[PDB]
Structure 1
Amino acid sequence: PASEQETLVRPKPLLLKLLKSVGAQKDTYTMKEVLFYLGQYIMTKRLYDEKQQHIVYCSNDLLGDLFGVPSFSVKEHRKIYTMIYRNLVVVN
């Protein structure tokens, strides 16, 4: 592959369940794809605050079970990446 910065990942089963609900089923995804799909899952389910759309409340949604937090701001990039990595493996 041309892009040295790309990340290929294999989601854990429950992350795969989430991704399949919003997107295509694949063996391997890229990290940028996973980020995009997670955001669109949030949009599709309206997990954000309508009057503060950069805040997400996900407790007891599948997303909250995966991330292990009840809520987060989309500005919290370290948190979002680290939680995502806790839900997949990077491909060798």
Structure 2
Amino acid sequence: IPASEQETLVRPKPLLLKLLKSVGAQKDTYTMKEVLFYLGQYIMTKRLYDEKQQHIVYCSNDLLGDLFGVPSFSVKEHRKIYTMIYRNLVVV
């Protein structure tokens, strides 16, 4: 992933904002760097990812799964993750 993508400005849709607000401050605009940071922290706070289980995030029992439209995914497949995140925001 190119470093410049981290500076991309986005506006999370309602339900993704709901998720982001349990770990970060509400903002009109976020950078992708922030969105990934917060999503990563959120994932850990709800036990969706455990280090002992091989890079897979299980989210079928959480709002994250609803938004990403998948029951689980690899933390190593970054391009896919970005695609899943773009389903839930509007670019500024």
TM-score, normalized by the shorter chain, greater than 0.5: yes
Output aligned runs, 1:9-88, within 5 Å: 9-52=10-53, 54-88=55-89
Task: Rate the CA distance shift 1:17–1:53 in 2: closer, same or farther, 3 A.
Answer: farther
* Deviations 1:29-85 (CA, angstroms, capped at 9, x unpaired): 001100010000011111113521521100130000000000011001111000101
Stretches of structure 2 lacking an aligned partner (at least 5 in a row): none
* 4+ residue segments displaced more than 2 Å: 1-5
* Structure with greater strand percent: 1
Contact 1:47/1:56, CA 8 A, preserved across alignment? yes
- How high is the TM-score relative to the length of structure 2? 0.89
How many residue pairs match? The answer is: 91
Task: Rate the CA distance shift 1:2–1:88 in 2: closer, same or farther, 3 A.
Answer: closer
Query: Where does residue 7 of structure 2 map in the other structure?
Result: 6
* Structure with greater helix percent: 2
| Percentage of identical aligned residues | 100
* Distance (Å, rounded) in 1 between the aligned partners of 2:23 and 2:33: 15
CA root-mean-square deviation: 2.9
- How high is the TM-score relative to the length of structure 1? 0.89
Contact 1:49/1:57, CA 8 A, preserved across alignment? no
* Distance (Å, rounded) in 1 between the aligned partners of 2:25 and 2:68: 21
Q: CA offset at residue 3 of structure 1?
A: 7.6
Stretches of structure 1 lacking an aligned partner (at least 5 in a row): none
* Distance (Å, rounded) in 2 between the aligned partners of 1:27 and 1:58: 26
